Amino acid sequence: GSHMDAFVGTWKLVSSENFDDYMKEVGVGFATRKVAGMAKPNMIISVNGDVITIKSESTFKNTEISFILGQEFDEVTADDRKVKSTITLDGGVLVHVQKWDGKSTTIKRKREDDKLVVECVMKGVTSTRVYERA
């Protein structure tokens, strides 16, 4: 077993705050913001050995990333950015940094009670997305 197994499972989005504003800051265009903003993704997190997989499934897009903590990888985001991603587990928080075009955004995922809370930050703008078990 591992600490990381607190995140494993199938999660459904229950609330969102400031996600349109976050996407604006990231540089997502109007039409993508509208359709992505309507998405209610389910997030499936699994671990096999050292490899963590996070899959997000919705009517907008289905995406999947697999990675080893601390080891950079190339990722194509749901909004079609080509980014360099590094994911670490710091003090029980999964911290995902994406770098592209001289820009950076950080996505933190934390357990809080029966929720999985996702905080996305792009410069000064934070979006909070709350998931519960499916």
Ligand SMILES: O=C(O)c1ccccc1C(=O)[C@H]1c2ccccc2S[C@@H]1c1csc2ccccc12
């Ligand atoms: O939805 C989240 O909770 C989330 C948080 C951080 C990173 C990715 C996500 C996602 O799940 C992303 C995703 C992936 C597949 C299907 C639908 C969605 S909505 C969201 C997303 C759409 S454009 C964009 C542009 C920037 C960031 C997210 C996003």
